[PDB]
Design an enzyme around this catalytic site. Structure first.
Site, PDB file in Angstrom:
ATOM      1  N   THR G   1      45.551  38.277  40.922  1.00  0.00           N
ATOM      2  CA  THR G   1      45.887  38.142  42.195  1.00  0.00           C
ATOM      3  C   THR G   1      46.914  38.926  42.747  1.00  0.00           C
ATOM      4  O   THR G   1      48.014  39.120  42.034  1.00  0.00           O
ATOM      5  CB  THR G   1      46.392  36.672  42.283  1.00  0.00           C
ATOM      6  OG1 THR G   1      45.134  35.771  41.893  1.00  0.00           O
ATOM      7  CG2 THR G   1      46.688  36.476  43.853  1.00  0.00           C
ATOM      8  N   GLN G   2      47.003  39.725  43.696  1.00  0.00           N
ATOM      9  CA  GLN G   2      47.828  40.201  44.375  1.00  0.00           C
ATOM     10  C   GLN G   2      47.818  40.112  45.716  1.00  0.00           C
ATOM     11  O   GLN G   2      47.453  39.004  46.297  1.00  0.00           O
ATOM     12  CB  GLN G   2      47.636  41.884  44.160  1.00  0.00           C
ATOM     13  CG  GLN G   2      46.733  42.214  42.792  1.00  0.00           C
ATOM     14  CD  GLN G   2      45.243  42.258  43.354  1.00  0.00           C
ATOM     15  OE1 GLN G   2      44.717  41.540  44.129  1.00  0.00           O
ATOM     16  NE2 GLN G   2      44.568  43.302  42.984  1.00  0.00           N
TER      17      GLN G   2
END
Ligand code: MG
Lengths: 222, 235, 244, 212, 231, 240, 233, 250
Positions: G1-2
């Site tokens: 996740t970014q």
């Protein structure tokens, strides 16, 4: 935060006849209030006289159908080109789904075909692989609009024979493929009127001993 | 020394060829496939009279529709049987159906060549796998440590095999009844066995579509032996 | 490849013997003789150091007798370096047991553990076995005073009196001749030293060629004391028993 | 959801409703909440439908492997413990299971084990699990005897599910009955609650609160 | 001699004897023929039985709808290599929506077989394969050797007495390459080719195995009474 | 890890490492098992080449695997401990998961499985041990006696012997053991077991061990004097 | 996740009678900062395919390298790399779609919306979409981000269904695309005036147009607009 | 690749000999003579700097090595084997002791750790034994001064004085006649130089002899002042000049 899931809308409907089965679904694909495609096929011929649709999150749907089609291919390789029966396909799909029990395919799966006696068969799955053979099953966005109508018009629920006043039920007489298709079309016409995610087109796959046939119908595009 | 997976100048795997010699020393096992069922019979060959012969288990159930007889180093068969049973049960779990006899046999034969420097040597045991499925009916397979399996109408393995196979060559026809096959296995076992055949040093079994795999009681086999003696004295 | 150079340390001979175990036992037969004698009021461990030198620092030297814990000691015959590997493992096992159960490890349990380690090297791994034979002298509140021996095969047995190393045949006959069940530690001390004096390959048995130990309940009241004898104390007991 | 199982003179009665819901939405009225593990063993479905289905047909596979290896029918004790040990491995991961493993062997007699997804394994005479369990317990507790006939025991199980089906919003559809004997279970039919309610009301005189 | 103990040892003349002994296993195997035109590719295989009670060992394995092979030598090794081909055909279809080119399939088989000829502990594969297929560049025929050598050909044969069939195909080259849009005549040419390798025995109904793939023809295997037409 | 295939086939179809493991068994002290009508007796030879032995603490030849099953052996002593430990762990594991103690056949099948595994696993040699496993199944009064050997084959026996000179004592048992009428009492069974060992043992002193196993976890080892009384009575009947 | 950092806005596209058109502006935004003004977001693969990418630019550059590597790899041991065994639009898309779905399944997505536009070997138009979730779909017109809300309605007035495609010329299609880019420039706060446009035609091949500008803009009417209600001056 | 020699290269022969250990000891026998002598107030270790070439700078080759501030080592046999053993011995003194107890190990325990490393090269898979014998001299608070010999087998023995390598048999006899329990460090150094001269053929001076002592604490070699308890290393390598001064009083 990254949300790995989405909702592509759509509504599907499986009905098992006496010697046939239909799996229908609208061809509209959506996110939120936008239309992605007015024609994105959702019901697939998977070989061995089996049709399948995994409605909900389209990425998981496409992945599952792809993996099942692949399972049919390898079933032939491993077991001397034996035909995968609908009950065997159903059990196999349970294991595909339950394999991701803790990161589920966010879909409601329905398959249709004929059992080993030649009778119409529909199987229905939840996202994590619990399944059951059913006579009638709507899935997706407008499932709650369609199922009560099917309870009434396919199984004749709450319908009694005039004059008896509730004493004698309306007898459960078998429906023809033409009769089923009428109920499918009216189900989707009604769902299109009252559900914003349903519309554009209706594609029906009909399974008999002769094979799989397709029928397409326009739905309202608003 | 030399690799366990070495080819001979003739193009044969030494270890596989040597395991075949161990199987030749094993007790005789015979299978006969008919349209009424497949019969499996074995020579028990107890090494001493104090050995309780009903503890000799050379015929084994893999599933309700598949049985198996062994010859050679019979201790090696236990993991093969375990695998077969697991494969049969696992396939039913995945597919809600019986597994094909050939598919089961192929699964067992996949273990065979998994040896090297996986297990340290090939299996020293041959299997007669008998069963029934809806697609190909009654079937008898011969699973070798080479990983090869042949389907047979009738087959004998073990020390009396070439004499028994010559006998099976003459006796088998496509119209044999189950009863005729039972007597035929008993007749050929009696021929090749060192000791005199009775219900305690020989064992019969069969697989039918209706009743599945069944190992015969010593009382049931004793009657078939008596029936055999009388029909041989009948001419 | 590598197979060419493999001695295959863990194989049977045609007679059903383990080559390396047998050859390790041959090695041990050239090691200095160690003797254990069990009495009703304690155990004696006596051992001969191998052909020593006058420049060897004896008072800080240890090649035969080792402490495993406060209750259990061992006499070594064979490769000293191999023995120390096993001794450290045994010391850790004793402490693991003490930590787990809050009780001192029973002698046999420790002996079985070390013997199982030796056994493993004879069955798997392709390594040479430990060229060591132990005499275990110990006490616990279940069996009291105990003597055991283990050898490179991992086999162990209990004894009233036993020898390992060189001239065990001669030593065992001499022990079997003079040992009695009602014997006491002071009598056992004399038997051990007399036996070594007769079986030794040296010209005479002196203090600088010996290691000596006693496990006694000659510790003030219901408790056990280990005594690793000092060079002067070995010299005194040699005079007391009339060997020098 | 309402599932019950109770031991009696003639073996075990297993009775379940048929309703599955997703919130207020009735997803199905035709759910099979008894899992036919094998011809001698039954399991009930409560909590997670998939978890119960998947792991109890898996249990059937383990039971089959046991009797192939040991040449003997698996005990209810052993069968139930295979399942409880399995779900205990998964404890914390989020399995949802409340089941009765029901069987009748020579050595044990009729036996019921309540098995739970948090690892609980309880042997007992009467168990009732689900959103409508309290209603079914009332009818069970006040009418249960060891010396019930197979006919009366079957009715008691049917009547207890009906009680739950009536009051509990998430129970209903139909009643499935089973009778477990030493020679295997016997299915005693599907009974629509709609039709059953009026039938029982008239014949029994109960449910006077409801106008019929 | 002193250099044939394992696959990791060159002889003084630069030979790999274990690979040569693996090659020898193919020569002991039953004859199988491959040949193609510009529209179709055909496999013909003489199946071998153990005795008169036994079945005839299957020789042809389907790898995909557009590809498959026939084997000569150790059958379990063919099962390992054909399974690997099935996976590679499958990977190409799933990931790239692309049917695996027959030439690329040969490259993959070469590389897989090569690893078993250069490392200690392993052994070479003891089987030869004839791969036929129809892809985006038309009909193809490959010959696989467990040395790793894969060769694209118009026609060939491997197994015992394969030299007779190979000489026949070398004569007929200009005829059978032109058999376009006529599957039956191409199979006839293959059945006539494999007949040049028979001695004492002849082609019976459970003896003969035929496979075909082409322009509008999925890879299909013919056994039993389906090949009686060609006997 | 060490992966070398020690147990392999020879040109004549023999696995010499397994056969040489049997030669280790042939060297081991004689063990004998005899089952009566309501008991099983395990007799074991103790070689008297080792005196000054402490018999309280020296590993006894018969080992309890559970409260109802015992195991004796012939061959390498150190090897036997590994099989005994594994069997004991499996016995407790079985009670824990099945909620029932092992049958004698199950325990035998397990030990035999371990022995077989060591004949086709890389880097290991076979156990130089044959075992006699005896006892009674839970809630069962039928005597059980099984034998295992290095190859991993196992079988049930009315009476059996293993180890050195086991050919001689088997000869005795084969002519003295009647199947139609097994030793009806503990006395008769122990007597026949001591008699069989006296064909081979030497002195009937501390050279014979006897362990009696009866139904419902009733296991007891006879003392020197109790055995000595059998030894005395046997030879006094022989002087005739 | 970014989270996406440097981002590209809408990619728009449509089918016409002989091929496909795709367009995207040349801006790499950094939040509300219009940071980079010369970013090419249409990446041609061979002479038959153009991949249009929106969203995270660092992931776009990664994908660009994957496609470059795909061309190199395809050429290996492939005598027909520039003929029958050249990369098809459908091969390129299926590969990307596999990667996108795999990455989202590892909870580490490539933060993009991608449109693969091209013409197949048999002359068929290829136009399909894939995004960070691995969701795929096809339509006569396709657009990402704001384009989906504003360009699609305009482009669908030209090609409303499959049967409109053969009736639509390249001049009408390009005109519609160019107008949509102007509308997006009026109304998308993360858009730029400068854009690229690519036409993949089955007859004339790949035509790649750089440094195009939004022109013919209406602003004059702004002079009359005063206040927010009651103000007259 | 992978190390496929997972089996012992040292094994028991029929006679009970461990061949590879015996052969390692033979390599030690060929090695240049080194010796150690323990005095009442110190230990001395010495060896010959056998220079392979006169162009080689033999000061860059340290045969006598500091292991801890109070422990030093010298060898006979294979130099490269010694060098890596010194590296391991230095590290193990930290990892298995100083990082646990906050102080350097006592001589006997460091010797024990080195001995363990050598023992493992005698049993572990795919290795040969180390071809060196070590003489380790050291001091610690509770054991005082000590001198140990460690052999290829991993066996170690404490000595009052000893010699290893080429002329060890003659040197040990020489030391037996001279050693007593009243020697001062300077007397031991004198005896060391006398003993070492017998086994040296060519030049005998401070540049061809390497000699170190374990003696008094050297606060001048500590590198810092301010902590009373820290008094500096007891190991000190004698300079070329310091050796030559004592060779005049020889
Ligand atoms: Mg609208």
């Amino acid at each position: 935060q990254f949300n790995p899931y989405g909702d592509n809308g759509g509504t599907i409907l499986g009905i098992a006849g006496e010697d046939f089965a239909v799996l229908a679904g609208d061809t509209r694909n959506i996110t939120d209030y936008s239309i992605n495609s007015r024609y994105e096929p959702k019901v697939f011929d998977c070989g061995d006289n089996i049709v399948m649709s995994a409605n909900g999150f389209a990425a998981d749907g496409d992945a599952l159908v792809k993996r099942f089609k692949n399972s049919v291919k390898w079933y032939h390789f491993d077991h001397n080109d034996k035909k995968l029966s609908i009950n065997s396909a159903a059990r196999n799909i349970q294991h595909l789904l339950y394999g991701k029990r803790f990161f589920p395919y966010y879909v409601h799966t329905i398959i249709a075909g004929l059992d080993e006696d030649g009778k119409g068969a529909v199987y229905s799955f939840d996202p994590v692989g619990s399944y059951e053979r059913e006579q009638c099953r709507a899935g997706g966005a407008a499932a709650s609009l369609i199922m009560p109508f099917l309870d009434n018009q396919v199984n004749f629920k709450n319908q009694y024979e005039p004059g008896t006043n509730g004493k004698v039920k309306k007898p459960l007489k078998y429906l023809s493929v033409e009769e089923v298709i009428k109920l499918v079309r009216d189900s989707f016409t009604s769902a299109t009127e009252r559900h914003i995610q349903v519309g554009d087109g209706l594609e029906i796959l009909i399974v008999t001993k002769d094979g799989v046939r397709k029928e397409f119908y326009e739905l309202k595009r608003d | 020394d030399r690799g366990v997976s070495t080819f001979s100048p003739e193009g044969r795997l030494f270890q596989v060829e040597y395991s075949l010699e161990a199987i030749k020393l094993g007790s005789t096992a015979i299978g006969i496939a008919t349209k009424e069922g497949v019969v499996l019979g074995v020579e028990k060959r107890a090494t001493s009279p104090l050995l309780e012969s009903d503890s000799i288990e050379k015929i084994v159930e893999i599933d309700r529709h598949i049985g198996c007889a062994m010859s050679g180093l019979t201790a090696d068969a236990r993991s093969m049987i375990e695998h077969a049973r697991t494969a049969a049960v696992t396939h039913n779990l995945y597919y809600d159906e019986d597994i094909n006899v050939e598919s089961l046999t192929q699964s067992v034969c996949d273990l065979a060549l998994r040896f090297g420097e996986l297990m340290s040597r090939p299996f020293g045991v041959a299997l007669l796998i008998a069963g029934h499925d809806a697609d190909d009916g009654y079937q008898l397979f011969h699973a070798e440590p080479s990983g090869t399996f042949y389907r047979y109408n009738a087959k004998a393995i073990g020390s009396g095999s070439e004499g028994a196979q010559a006998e099976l060559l003459n006796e088998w026809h496509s119209s044999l009844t189950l009863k005729e096959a039972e007597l035929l296995v008993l007749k050929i076992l009696k021929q090749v066995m060192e000791e005199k055949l009775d219900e305690n040093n020989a064992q019969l079994s069969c697989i039918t579509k209706q009743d599945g795999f069944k190992i015969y009681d010593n009382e049931k086999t004793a009657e078939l032996i008596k029936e055999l003696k009388e029909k041989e004295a009948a001419e | 490849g590598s197979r060419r150079y493999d001695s295959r340390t863990t194989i049977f001979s045609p007679e059903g013997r383990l080559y390396q175990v047998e050859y390790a036992l041959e090695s041990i037969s050239h090691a200095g003789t160690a003797i254990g004698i069990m009495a009703s009021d304690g155990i004696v461990l006596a051992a001969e150091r191998k052909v020593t030198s006058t420049l060897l620092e004896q008072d800080t030297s240890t090649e035969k007798l080792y402490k495993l814990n406060d209750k259990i000691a061992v006499a070594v015959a064979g490769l000293t370096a191999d023995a120390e590997i096993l001794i450290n493992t045994a010391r850790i096992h004793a402490q693991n047991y003490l930590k787990t159960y809050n009780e001192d490890i029973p002698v046999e349990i420790l002996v079985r553990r070390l013997s199982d380690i030796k056994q493993g090297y004879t069955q798997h791994g392709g390594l040479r076995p430990f060229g060591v034979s132990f005499i275990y002298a110990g006490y616990d509140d279940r069996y009291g005073y105990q003597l055991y021996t283990s050898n490179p095969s991992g086999n162990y047995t209990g004894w009233k009196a036993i020898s390992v190393g060189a001239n065990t045949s001669a030593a065992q006959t001499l022990l079997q001749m003079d040992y009695k069940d009602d014997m006491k530690v002071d009598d056992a001390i004399e038997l051990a030293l007399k036996t070594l004096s007769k079986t030794t390959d040296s010209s005479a048995l002196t203090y600088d060629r010996l290691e000596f130990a006693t496990i006694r309940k000659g510790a003030n009241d219901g408790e056990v004391y280990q005594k690793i004898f000092k060079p002067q104390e070995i010299k005194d007991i040699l005079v007391k028993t009339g060997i020098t | 959801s309402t599932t019950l199982a109770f031991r009696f003179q003639g073996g075990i009665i297993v009775a379940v409703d048929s309703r599955a819901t997703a919130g207020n939405w009735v997803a199905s009225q035709t759910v099979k909440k008894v899992i036919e593990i094998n011809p001698f063993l039954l399991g009930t479905m409560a909590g997670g439908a998939a978890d119960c289905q998947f792991w109890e047909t898996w249990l059937g596979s383990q039971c089959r492997l046991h009797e192939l290896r040991e040449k003997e029918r698996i005990s209810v004790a052993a069968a139930s413990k295979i399942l409880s040990n399995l779900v205990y491995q998964y404890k914390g991961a989020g399995l949802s299971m409340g089941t009765m493993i029901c069987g009748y062997t020579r050595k044990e007699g009729p036996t019921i084990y309540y098995v739970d997804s948090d690892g609980t394994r309880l042997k007992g005479d009467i168990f009732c699990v689900g959103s409508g369990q309290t209603f079914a317990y009332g009818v069970l507790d006040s009418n249960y005897k060891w010396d019930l006939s197979v006919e009366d025991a079957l009715y008691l199980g049917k009547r207890s599910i009906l009680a739950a089906a009536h009051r509990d919003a998430y129970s209903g559809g139909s009643v499935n009955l089973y009778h477990v004997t030493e020679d295997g279970w016997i299915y005693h039919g599907n009974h629509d609650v709609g039709e059953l309610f009026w039938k029982v009301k008239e014949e029994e005189g109960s449910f006077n609160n409801v106008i019929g | 001699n002193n250099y044939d103990g394992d696959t990791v040892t060159f002889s003084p003349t630069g030979r790999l004897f274990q690979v040569e002994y693996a090659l020898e296993a193919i020569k002991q195997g039953s004859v199988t023929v491959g040949l193609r035109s510009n529209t179709h590719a055909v496999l013909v295989a003489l199946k071998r039985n153990a005795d008169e009670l036994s079945s005839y060992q299957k020789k042809i394995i389907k790898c995909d709808e557009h590809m498959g092979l026939s084997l000569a030598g150790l059958a379990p090794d063919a099962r390992v290599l054909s399974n690997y081909l099935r996976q590679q055909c499958n990977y190409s279809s799933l990931v790239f929506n692309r049917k695996l080119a027959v030439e690329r399939a040969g490259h993959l088989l070469c590389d897989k077989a090569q690893k078993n000829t250069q490392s200690y502990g392993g052994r070479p594969y003891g089987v030869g394969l004839l791969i036929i297929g129809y892809d985006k560049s038309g009909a193809h025929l490959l010959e696989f050797q467990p040395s790793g050598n894969v060769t694209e050909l118009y026609g060939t044969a491997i197994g015992a007495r394969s030299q007779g069939a190979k000489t026949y195909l070398e004569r007929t080259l200009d005829t059978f390459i032109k058999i376009d849009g006529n599957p039956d005549e191409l199979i006839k040419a293959g059945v006539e080719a494999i007949s040049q390798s028979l001695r004492d025995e002849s082609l019976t109904v459970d003896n003969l195995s035929i496979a075909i793939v082409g322009k509008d023809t999925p890879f299909t295997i013919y056994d039993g009474e389906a090949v009686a037409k060609y006997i | 890890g060490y992966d070398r295939a020690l147990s392999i086939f020879s040109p004549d179809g023999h696995i010499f490492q397994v056969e040489y493991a049997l030669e280790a068994v042939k060297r081991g002290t004689c063990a004998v098992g005899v089952k009566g009508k309501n008991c099983v007796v395990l007799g074991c030879e103790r070689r008297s080449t080792l005196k000054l032995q402490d018999t309280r603490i020296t590993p006894s030849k018969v080992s309890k695997i559970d409260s109802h099953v015992v195991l004796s052996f012939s061959g390498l002593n150190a090897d036997s401990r590994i099989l005994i430990e594994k069997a004991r762990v499996e016995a407790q594991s079985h009670r824990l998961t099945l909620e029932d103690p092992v049958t004698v056949e199950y325990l035998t099948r397990y030990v035999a499985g371990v022995q077989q595994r060591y004949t086709q696993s890389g880097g290991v040699r076979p156990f130089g041990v044959s075992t006699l496993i005896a006892g009674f199944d839970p809630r069962d009064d039928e005597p059980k006696l099984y034998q295992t050997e290095p190859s991993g084959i196992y079988s049930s026996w009315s009476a059996q012997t293993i180890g050195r000179n086991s050919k001689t004592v088997r000869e005795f048992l084969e002519k003295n053991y009647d199947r139609k009428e097994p030793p009806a009492t503990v006395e008769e069974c122990v007597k026949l077991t001591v008699r069989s060992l006296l064909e081979v043992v030497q002195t009937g002193a501390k050279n014979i061990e006897i362990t009696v196993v009866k139904p419902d976890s009733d296991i007891v080892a006879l003392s020197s004097e109790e055995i000595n009384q059998y030894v005395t009575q046997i030879e006094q009947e022989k002087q005739e | 996740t970014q989270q996406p950092i440097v981002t590209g806005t809408s990619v728009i596209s449509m089918k016409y009678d002989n091929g496909v058109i795709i367009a995207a502006d040349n801006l790499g935004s950094y939040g509300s900062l219009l940071r980079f003004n010369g970013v090419e977001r249409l990446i041609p693969v061979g002479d038959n395919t153009v991949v249009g990418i929106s969203g995270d630019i660092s992931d776009m550059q990664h994908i660009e390298r994957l496609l470059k590597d795909l061309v190199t790899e395809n050429a290996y041991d492939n005598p027909l790399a520039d003929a029958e065994e050249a990369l098809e639009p459908s091969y390129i898309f299926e590969y990307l779609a596999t990667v996108m779905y795999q990455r989202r399944s590892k909870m580490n997505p490539l933060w993009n919306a991608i449109i693969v536009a091209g013409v197949q070997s048999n002359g068929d138009q290829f136009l399909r979409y894939v995004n960070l979730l691995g969701v795929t779909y096809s339509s006569p017109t396709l657009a990402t981000g704001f384009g989906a809300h504003m360009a699609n309605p305009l482009l669908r007035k030209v090609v409303d269904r499959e049967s409109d495609i053969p009736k639509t010329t390249v001049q009408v299609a390009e005109e519609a695309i160019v107008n949509a880019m102007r509308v997006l420039y009026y109304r998308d706060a993360r858009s730029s005036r400068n854009f690229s446009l690519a036409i993949i035609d089955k007859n004339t091949g790949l035509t790649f147009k750089k440094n195009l500008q939004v022109e013919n803009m209406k602003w004059d009417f702004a002079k009359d607009i005063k206040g927010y209600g009651t103000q007259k001056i | 690749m992978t190390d496929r020699y997972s089996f012992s290269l040292t094994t028991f022969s029929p006679s009970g000999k461990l061949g590879q250990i015996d052969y390692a000891l033979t390599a030690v026998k060929q090695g240049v003579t080194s010796l150690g002598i323990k005095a009442t107030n110190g230990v001395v270790i010495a060896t010959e700097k056998k220079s392979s070439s006169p162009l080689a700078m033999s000061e860059t080759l340290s045969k006598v090595s500091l292991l801890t501030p109070d422990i030093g080592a010298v060898y006979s046999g294979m130099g490269p084997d010694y060098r890596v053993l010194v590296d391991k011995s230095r590290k193990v003194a930290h990892t298995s002791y100083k990082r646990i107890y906050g102080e350097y190990p006592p001589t006997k325990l460091l010797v024990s750790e080195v001995a363990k490393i050598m023992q493992e090269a005698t049993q572990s898979g795919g290795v040969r034994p180390f071809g060196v014998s070590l003489l380790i001299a050291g001091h610690d608070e509770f054991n005082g001064f000590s001198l140990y010999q460690v052999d290829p087998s991993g066996s170690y023995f404490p000595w009052k004085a000893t010699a290893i390598g080429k002329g060890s048999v003659a040197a040990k006899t020489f030391l037996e006649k001279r050693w007593n329990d009243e020697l001062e460090l300077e007397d031991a150094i004198h005896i060391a130089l006398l003993t070492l001269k017998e086994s040296v053929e060519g030049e005998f001076n401070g540049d061809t002899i390497e000699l170190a002592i374990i003696g008094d604490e050297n606060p001048d070699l500590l590198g810092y002042t301010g902590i009373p308890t820290d008094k500096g290393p007891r190991f000190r390598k004698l300079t070329s000049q310091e050796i030559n001064d004592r060779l005049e009083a020889l």
